[PDB]
Structures are given as structure tokens and as C-alpha cells.
Amino acid sequence: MQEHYQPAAIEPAAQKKWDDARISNVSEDASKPKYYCLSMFPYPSGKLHMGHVRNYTIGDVLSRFKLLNGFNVMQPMGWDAFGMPAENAAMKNNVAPAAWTYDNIEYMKTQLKSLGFAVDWEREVATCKPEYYRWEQWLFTKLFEKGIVYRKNGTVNWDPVDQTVLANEQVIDGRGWRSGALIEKREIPMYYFKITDYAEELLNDLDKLEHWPEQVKTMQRNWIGKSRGMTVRFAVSDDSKQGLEGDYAKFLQVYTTRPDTLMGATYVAVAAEHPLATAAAADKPELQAFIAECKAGSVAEADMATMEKKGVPTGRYVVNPLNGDKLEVWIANYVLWGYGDGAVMAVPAHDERDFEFAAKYNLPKKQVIAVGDNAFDANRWQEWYGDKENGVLVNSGDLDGLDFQTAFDAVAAKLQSQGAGEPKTQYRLRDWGISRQRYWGCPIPIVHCEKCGNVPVPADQLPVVLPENVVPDGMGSPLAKMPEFYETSCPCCGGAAKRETDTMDTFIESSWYFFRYMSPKFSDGMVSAESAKYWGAVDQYIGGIEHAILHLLYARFFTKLMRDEGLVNVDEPFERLLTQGMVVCETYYRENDKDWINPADVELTFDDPVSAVLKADGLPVVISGTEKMSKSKNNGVDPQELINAYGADTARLFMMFAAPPEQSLEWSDSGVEGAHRFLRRLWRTVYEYLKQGGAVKAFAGNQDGLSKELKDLRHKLHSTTAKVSDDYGRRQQFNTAIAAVMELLNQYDKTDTGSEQGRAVAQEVLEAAVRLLWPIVPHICETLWSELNGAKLWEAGWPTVDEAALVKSEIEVMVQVNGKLADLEAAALANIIVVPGRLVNIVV
Ligand SMILES: CCCCCc1ccc(-c2cn(CCC[C@@H]3CO[C@H](COS(=O)(=O)NC(=O)[C@@H](N)CC(C)C)[C@@H](O)[C@H]3O)nn2)cc1
Ligand SMILES: [Mg+2]
Ligand SMILES: [Zn+2]
């Protein structure tokens, strides 16, 4: 055994050892219990970053833990290949997106392999390959025929200078982020998934997910935003019907979730697009400008609550059907045309948004709810104003004294009898638009024929192949400028026709890839029936919390779609969900005429730390704040340089030890040094142990007659095995498992293991430690295990807890007072000559 730990020697040999034995190349083996551990597959954007290493290390810890416990473990990897990165790389480098993508894949695949992840590379998929995306084209056509996918006109932000559609997050002050030109809102036909048809299923099935973090479930419930409220109609007043046609001349209809406060409504508010807004504004230039400023707005939903709410009175009036109050209609910028009826009532006393709106414009506030003897201050909001559960109605006439639920049904009965309203269930969730006006994505399998309409490509003709020898312009989607691609013949009539040139939302590829891993070479469908039945669902899923809403909701949706097609046998794709935090790092710059400097290029001073300096020279640097690793502040530490400097095991140890998965991990040079120094110590402990006499059979069985010191070390060992097992299995906190193995070795360090029995216990200690740590640092553990023991480590299995080692010793002595019934004296006085271990007599 080499004296000094040298990872560049041992790590490739171990990787070859695992690969030769094919421990990760798994099949549908009915004799071993399956375990499907999945990390979110990466965008192939060039190189691994520290987030990647953290995520796939967490995945591999859990995989190897289950492997050592005898499961048939599938841990597959692949490439989420379509999307904008390749498009912009094409624009900057004048290379094809595909060629750039396949090169990134080759380089990142090498990096993952050098880290030693126990991955079944025979199940590798790349979603930009027609062998993959043909199957989502297949499902698309099938759902299109059923109407689950449909084509509808929708409005988008057009940038007229850069000639492309822009996401709403990509609009600042009504202008495109790169171009800086005023965006134009335009109506174009687009494709939608009818996800709202599955809203109630998607909402309710969350309750099944007992091993998901509650905050993820809460975020999904809120995103779906189901509510049971009331449709309420207010009759338009005699004087306010000018310019209105239809039922809009008769009433204004609103939806509210608080009909128990209908007695407290003090005004009503409508969207800028509402007919009442249009008729009111026809002779009022200030209203026309307000209507225009609303329509020009572009507020993404994470910013709708954070925008200043503004309104304009219209001079038009409606009547509360329950008390008779004439109420003014306002136009307001928070009422969205498309949600509900584009019209709401306002109760400033019991809705905080209405409170603030009414405070701004000095609109009335009428308290109709009371919670105990709480004082109502019409000038200061209080939390209890919005209380649904423990409130009771006041100032409501014949409704006074009712709680929320019985008031709700009382209002519902009154409204329904006179025809002024009825209960209604609503959902915030919108349908999912999948059209993208972009090149590097899966083609939409629709052929447009002026005789036959929107026609799906027949299954015999799929895939519609994206041509790969394209170098994106900049001036619009290339597919629309390629007659060689879109000029085709119609599949139903055989005449001249045009392919759809929009591509699919790349969220689609990541909504089913976990099923494709089950049979990635299956040419007859999305997933083979036999494989889906064996593998079932993902047992454990690991990824970043930033995917908690959209990606997770889309994947659950696709699972239910595929189940209903008859392809899979599960309702939910992901049983356990572990969300990983971000990686942060200090930032450094230097002022010019700021140019942010990468940390691996900087060197720090010290004392016994003054400042920092650039490695290439010696000019000082500006140490600034710690934040997430990014291109923006050039504070991303290349994982390749960590591996080059210390080896894969040190990289993995640092990430697992520095922070629990949910927590932000802070890059630290000394921390990485600490992890490397522990691996040297681990190496030194085994080497010194074997230097003093070589391996022996590990201690096992009855421990009576072992010295107290060695019994104590066995107690620490088997308590450490139980702790680490609970840390990997239940808590999924890996730092405390490393700490526990560290404590075991510390106790071993202070124990004389030189005797014959001492060596046997030492062998037991070391054979456990290297297996307890193997999921985390498998290369050094693999090599150390082969020096201690000839059996194959994965066949030796997870260390067992020897409960006999956890039973503390017993000695029963009698205690008598005047002849009749240090260590034992203090305990018997807690109940004087002492005959050792047998008897004590309290002579008094
Ligand atoms: C030279 C470049 C320097 C870059 C510097 C840098 C930048 C960022 C971070 C960082 C990020 N996070 C936060 C956690 C990042 C996780 C990384 O692993 C996985 C792959 O991520 S992905 O490839 O983005 N794919 C995807 O997100 C989709 N293909 C997944 C589908 C299933 C939807 C995901 O689970 C991420 O959520 N923490 N740290 C660290 C370093
Ligand atoms: Mg259950
Ligand atoms: Zn036709």
C-alpha cells in the first residue's frame, strides 16, 4: 500500500473497476428490488458548474447507499439539449446549435465520469435527437386529435428591431432588453395544452405526496389557485346604460371569494377592456389614456402584487343586489381581462388590497365582519380584518351573527332566488402555451393545408426532423425562412401545404424524460410497457428549488396524460423530492476607466487577512459581497480546477460536508483544504493500521470478555452505523453523517488497539468506516476496502447495527441498612462498607 494518498492514481483504477463489473448498468431484474434515483438532467451548455457537482453528488450518495443495501438501482443521466443557449452560441460563434450541443455533451460526459458517479450510461438520452423528440411529437398529435392540445389566437410581445418574440420577463419599461425598442403586442395563432382540464386532479393528488417538502406542495396549490366563491350580478343603474349592449346593458357580473362581505362592498372595479370601461371612456379623454396605459402594460405574475394599483372613476353606477346601495364603477389596473369576468367588487374593510386602494382615493370602508371585541380602525389595517375562520357578521342586516360558511350559503340562497348570482369554482391556472418562435427546439408536427386545415403528421411519418445544418440569423426564426423545410405536401389530400415553423416549449422534453430512461432505445413508443411496469415511478428525485413550480407541475401533468393514454401505470412521477439550495461565492473586481475577476484567479493575504491580490501579478483586488455563482459577477468557481487540484473525492466530500442540501453552500478554500486533509487522514489511518501487522478477521459476535475500552469503541462504532444510516435514509443530511464518522475515528485514535482483540475491533472499525463513507467518497473507500478485505465491497453490503454492542453493562447488588435489606456508595445513597460488586451496607 502506497504511503501517501494520491487521488489521480487511485480514482481512474476504481472507475475502471466499477465499469468492468457493470454495477451501474442495470436491467429489469425481477429478483432484486428496484430503486430509481434521479437527478434533474442538465442543459449541455459547455462545462459542469458547482451546482451540477453538488446535485449529482447528492444523487450518487443516495444511489450508492441503496446499492449497498441491495437494491437494483437505476441512476440515469442525459441532456436537456434544446433551448436558447445553443441559439446564442450560434450567433456569437457562427456554428450550428447541434454541433455546439454535441460537443458540450462529449466534454460534460467526460467530467461526470471523472467524478465517479454510479450512472447507467447505457440509458443516456439527448433530447435534441429525433429518436427522442419523435415521441413527444407523437403524443402531441394524439392529444391534438382529442382536443387536449388546441390552436388558438394569443397575444405576444413582438420586438420589431430584433425581429423576435420576447418573454414578459424580457420587457423593461415597455421595451426589449437587448434592442431597447418599444415592444408591439400582436395576436398570433399558438398551440396550448388544456392543462386546466386536469387542475382538480393536479391539485388533489398533491395530498398523496407525503414525502415532498410542504413548501413545494404549498407553492403548487397556490399556483393552481383553486377557489370556491360566488358569481354576483349588479344591475346597471338607469342612468348608466349609455353605450352598453347586451347583458352589459343589464348588469355587471363579478366573481368574489368573500360573498359573506357583500354587505360591505363600497365600489366596483372593471378591467380596461371591459365594455363598461369602453362606454364610459367614449367621451372622457383621461379614461381613454388610462385604458391605453393598462393595455400597454407587461407585468409578469411575480410582479403583479408588487405593482402600484391605480384606478379611475367612470361616473357609471350599479346596484348591490343584497342591500340596494348604488355603487360607482372604477377602471383599475389590477383587474385582468381573461380572469373571471374581468370585474370585481371591493370591500376595503376586509381585503387588504381594497383597503389600500380605498385609502389612496378616500373611498368608503364599511366594516361588516367582527372577530371578538377587536376594535376596528378605519384608518389602520389590522390582520384580523381579513379573518375567514373565527369572524362573525355585523352591519349586514338579516345576516348579522353568522360565521363565514353559513353566511356564504345564506348569501347564495338569496342571490339564486332572485337570479342575481350563484356559487362558482375558479382556478388561477392558465392553459400552457407551447409554441415558441425559435429554431433550436422540437418541431410541432402540424401541416397547414388551405383545404384540410391544421393537420397532424401521421404516426408513420414521425419524426418531423429539425434540420441540423442551420446557423441562426438574429432576424427571426430560421425555420420560417427555409422553404426547403416548410414546403411540403398535405398528409390528407396530397396537395401543396406548409409545415408549422414554431417549435415546442423545451419544458416538454423535461416533462417525460424520466419515463424514457426506462426504455431509451424503444422504437415502438414513448416507453415500453414491460419497463414502465417494472420501474414504476421515480423513488427519489433531486434538483434545484427553482424548479418547484413549473417543471414539477408539467411533469405531473404529463404523467397523468401518459397514464390516460395507457402508457404508464402511475398517478405521480416523483415519490420523494429533495430540493437543493444554491452555491454562492465571494466576488472580486477592479475599477476601470468594474471588471469582475474570477476567484480562482485571485490570491488572499493573511495575518496569523489584510486584502486580496491578482495571481498573475500583484496589484490589489476589491473584495466584495458573497452571492450566487453567476456569469454576471464572474464568481463561478470552475469545478474542473477543483478536480485538477485535489481529485474527485475531495470535491464530493467538500460539497456534502459544507452544507445540508437545502442550505446555500458557500465556496471556501480552507473548507476544501479541510476535506482533502480528512482524506489524507483516512488514508493514513488505514496505512498505519496495516503497517503494524496486516489485516485480520474483523471482530464479530459475543463481546463479553472484551476490555471496557474496546467495548466502548464498539458502542461508538455501531451507534455511528445507526446514525449514518438514519442520515442517508431518513434525514438526508450528509454533513452530520461525515461528522459522525469523524467522531468514530477520533475515539479510535484514543483507543489502544494493539492487542489481539484490539486489532480485531480495529479491523471492524475500519471496515465499517470505509463502507459508511463509500457513498460519499467511493474512490478512496474502494481502494482502502481492497487493502482491508478481499471480498467485493458492494457484495459485503451496508454495515449492520450490532445491537448487543449498544447494551450497557449490568451489575445488581443489594443495599441494606444495619445488616438487613465509591461507585456503588453514591448510588445506594441515592436509594458504609462495600464488598466489591456484590453488596453494600449503610452502617448507620
Ligand atoms: C462557466 C459557467 C459558470 C456557471 C456558474 C454557476 C452558475 C450556477 C450555479 C448554481 C445553480 N444552482 C441552483 C441549482 C442548479 C441545479 C443543477 O443541477 C440540475 C441541472 O441544472 S441545469 O443544467 O441548469 N438544468 C436544468 O435546470 C434543467 N435541465 C432541469 C430540467 C429537469 C427542467 C438542476 O437540478 C439545477 O436546479 N446552484 N448553483 C453554479 C455555478
Ligand atoms: Mg402513501
Ligand atoms: Zn390537404
3-state secondary structure at position 729: helix
Rounded CA separation 13/647 (Å): 13
Q: Which residue has the cell 455563482?
A: 629
HEC string of 336-377 equals: CCCCCCCEEEECCCCCHHHHHHHHHHCCCCCCCEECCCCCCC
Closest CA to 157 of 147, 166, 146: 166
Q: Are 772 and 724 in contact (CB under 8 A)?
A: yes
49 lines ligand 1 (CB under 6 A): yes
Residue nearest to atom 28 of ligand 1 (CA): 42
Cα 333 to Cα 690: distance, rounded to the nearest angstrom: 77
- Residues after which the chain is discontinuous, using a C–N cutoff of 2.5 Å: 593, 608, 821, 831
Q: For strands 538-544 and 574-580, give the pairing.
A: parallel
- φ and ψ at 16, to 5 degrees? -60, -40
Dist. CA 577 → ligand 2 center (Å): 14
| CB of residue 104 inside a 6 A radius of ligand 1 | no
Is the beta carbon of 768 within 6 A of some atom in ligand 1?
no
- Map 94-155 to HEC letters: CCCHHHHHHHHHHHHHHHHHHCCCCCCHHHCEECCCHHHHHHHHHHHHHHHHHCCEEEEEEE
User: Which atom of ligand 1 lies nearest, measured to the CA of 546?
Assistant: 37
Q: What gap in Å lies between CA 16 and CA 23, rounded to an integer?
A: 11
In angstroms, the CA 214 to CA 206 distance is: 10
- CA nearest ligand 1 atom 23, residue: 42
- Please tell me the number of the ligand nearest to residue 208's CA: 2
Of the candidates 689, 690, 774, 699, the one whose C-alpha atom is nearest the C-alpha of residue 734 is 774
Q: How far apart are CA 163 and CA 159, in angstroms?
A: 6
398: cell is 338579516
Q: Could you tell me the three cell numbers for 76?
A: 440515469
Distance from Cα 580 to the centre of ligand 1, integer Å:
10
Task: Say which ligand is closest to the CA of 494.
Answer: 3
Ligand nearest to the CA of 107: 1
Closest CA to 269 of 349, 363, 350: 363
Residue 460: partners with Cβ closer than 8 Å, 6 or more residues away: none
Angstrom distance (rounded) from CA 341 to CA 829: 82
- Ligand 1, atom 26: closest residue by C-alpha: 42
| CA distances, 606 to each of 582, 590, 603, 667, 808 (Å) | 28, 20, 10, 18, 49
CB neighbours of 44 closer than 8 A, spacing ≥ 6?
A: 79, 80, 81, 101, 104, 105, 108, 126
Q: Quick check: CB of 506 below 6 Å from ligand 1? A: no
- For residue 338, what are the contacts with CB-CB under 8 A and spacing of at least 6? none
Backbone angles phi and psi of 112, in degrees to 5: -55, -40
Contact 58, 577 (CB under 8 A): no
Which segments of 362-472 does DSSP mark as H helices, in order?
404-418
Q: How far is the CA of 546 from the centre of ligand 1 (A)?
A: 9
Q: Contact 456/141 with Cβ under 8 angstroms?
A: yes
Are 87 and 128 in contact, with CB atoms under 8 Å apart? no
Ligand 2 centroid to 571 CA: how many Å?
A: 12
Give the three cell numbers for residue 59: 444523487
Q: What are phi and psi of 660, to 5 degrees?
A: -60, 155
Dist CA 579 CA 39 (whole Å): 10
Distance (Å) from CA 565 to ligand 3 centroid: 27
Contact (Cβ atoms closer than 8 angstroms) between residue 772 and residue 721: yes
- Residue 114, phi-psi category: left (phi > 0), alpha (psi -120 to 50), beta (remainder): alpha
Query: SS3 for 187?
Result: strand
Tell me the residue ranges of DSSP E strands in 359-477. Answer: 369-370, 392-393, 421-427, 432-433, 435-436, 446-449, 453-456
Residue 214 three-state SS: helix
> Is the CB–ligand 1 distance for residue 547 below 6 Å?
yes
Per the listing, cell 403548487 goes with 220
- In 3D space, the residue among 93, 62, 85 whose CA is nearest the CA of residue 75 turns out to be 62
In CATH, which superfamily holds the domain spanning 628-806? Isoleucyl-tRNA Synthetase; Domain 1 (1.10.730.10)
Nearest ligand 1 atom to the CA of 635 is: 5
Q: Whose CA is nearest to atom 21 of ligand 1?
A: 42
Please give the number of the atom of ligand 1 that sits closest to the Cα of 545. Answer: 37
Rounded CA separation 620/367 (Å)? 64
Cβ 585 under 6 angstroms from ligand 1: no
Instruction: Output the DSSP codes for 462-474.
Output: ---PPPS-----S
User: Which 3 state secondary structure label does DSSP give 313?
Assistant: strand
Of 767, 585, 734, nearest in space to 57 by CA: 734
Distances (CA, A) of 597 to 66, 220, 612: 42, 39, 11
Contact between 125 and 516 under an 8 Å Cβ cutoff? The reply is: yes
Element (H, E) at 741: helix 735-749
Identity at 78, one-letter amino acid code: G
43 Cβ closer than 6 Å to some ligand 1 atom:
yes
The DSSP secondary structure of 603-664, one letter per residue, reads EE-------EEESSS--EEEEEEEEE--TTTT-PPPHHHHHHHH-HHHHHHHHHHHS-TTSP
Quote the cell numbers at residue 475: 432576424
Residue located nearest, by CA, to atom 35 of ligand 1: 543
Q: Is 223 left (phi over 0), alpha (psi -120 to 50) or beta?
A: alpha
The residue count for the chain: 844
Q: Please give the distance, rounded to the nearest whole angstrom, from the Cα atom of residue 446 to the centre of ligand 3.
A: 12
Establish whether residue 52 lines the binding site of ligand 1, counting it when its CB lies within 6 angstroms of any ligand atom.
yes
Q: Which ligand is nearest to the CA of 585?
A: 1
**Under 8 Å between Cβ of 301 and 214:** no
CA angle 221, 226, 230 (to 5 degrees): 155
Q: What is the C-alpha to C-alpha distance for residues 570 and 787, in angstroms, rounded to an integer?
A: 45
Please name which ligand lies nearest the alpha carbon of 451.
3
Spatial neighbors of 106 by CB under 8 A, at least 6 apart, are: none
Distance of alpha carbon 744 from alpha carbon 758, whole angstroms: 15
Spatial CA neighbour of 171 closest among 338, 303, 334, 310: 303
CA of 570 to the centre of ligand 2 (A): 13
Looking at ligand 1, which atom is closest to the CA of residue 542? 35
What DSSP element (H or E) covers 556? Answer: helix 550-565
CB 563 within 8 A of CB 599: no
Look up cell 368574489; give the residue. Answer: 256
Task: Tell whether ligand 1 has an atom less than 6 A from the beta carbon of residue 543.
Answer: yes
- Grid cell digits, residue 579: 430540493
The 8-class DSSP code of residue 731 comes to I
Contact 832, 841 (CB under 8 A): yes
User: Phi-psi bin for 476: left (phi > 0), alpha (psi -120 to 50), beta?
Assistant: left
Question: CB of 599 closer than 6 A to ligand 1?
Answer: no
Q: Cite the beta strand spans of 321-420 per DSSP E.
A: 326-332, 343-346, 369-370, 392-393
Query: Distance (Å, rounded) from C-alpha 815 to C-alpha 805?
Result: 29
Q: Are 761 and 699 in contact (CB under 8 A)?
A: yes
Instruction: Name the residue with the closest Cα to ligand 1, atom 37.
Output: 544
CA–CA gap between residue 467 and residue 463 (Å, rounded): 12
Question: CB neighbours of 573 closer than 8 A, spacing ≥ 6?
Answer: 514, 515, 537, 538, 541, 555, 556, 558, 559
Q: Where are the alpha helices (DSSP H) in 420-511?
A: 483-486
Question: Phi/psi at 129 (nearest 5 deg)?
Answer: -90, 135
- State residue 73 phi and psi, 5-degree precision: -95, 125
Looking at residue 807, its amino acid is V
Number of helices followed by number of strands (H, E) in the chain: 24, 35
The helix (run of H) or strand (run of E) holding residue 165 is strand 164-166
Lookup result for grid cell 419599461: 173
**Interval between CA 230 and ligand 2 midpoint (Å):** 34
Q: Is 758 in the pocket of ligand 1 (CB under 6 A)?
A: no
Please report, as a single letter, which amino acid is at residue 559: T
Element (DSSP H or E) covering residue 575 = strand 574-580
Whether a cis peptide bond, with omega within 30° of 0, leads into 639 is: no
For a substitution probing ligand 1, which of 45, 80, 538, 542 has the most ligand atoms within 8 Å of its CB? Answer: 80
Cα–Cα distance measured from residue 342 to residue 255, given in angstroms and rounded to the nearest whole number:
9
Which atom of ligand 1 is the closest one to the Cα of 555?
Answer: 32
CA dihedral sign of residues 40, 45, 47, 51: negative
Ligand 3 centroid – CA 786 distance (Å): 69
Residue 597, classed as helix, strand or coil, is strand
- Ligand 1 atom having least distance to the Cα of 583: 39
Q: Ligand 1 mean position to 507 CA, how many Å?
A: 15
How far is Cα 695 from Cα 5, in angstroms, rounded to an integer?
19
Resolution given for this structure, in angstroms:
2.2
Is 414 near ligand 1, meaning CB less than 6 Å away? Answer: no
Q: What kind of experiment solved this structure?
A: X-ray
Alpha-carbon distance of 518 to 587, in angstroms, equals: 42
Q: Whose CA is nearest to atom 38 of ligand 1?
A: 582
**Geometric angle at alpha carbon 427, from 425 and 433, rounded to 5°:** 145
The CB of 582 under 6 Å from ligand 1? The reply is yes
For residues 823 and 828, what is the distance between their CA atoms, to the nearest angstrom? 9
Largest CA distance in the chain: 117
Please enumerate in sequence order all residues whose Cβ is within 8 A of that of 643, keeping only pairs 6 or more positions apart, or say none.
111, 114, 115, 651
Residue nearest to atom 11 of ligand 1 (CA): 51
- What's the rounded Cα separation, in Å, for the pair 731 and 65? 13
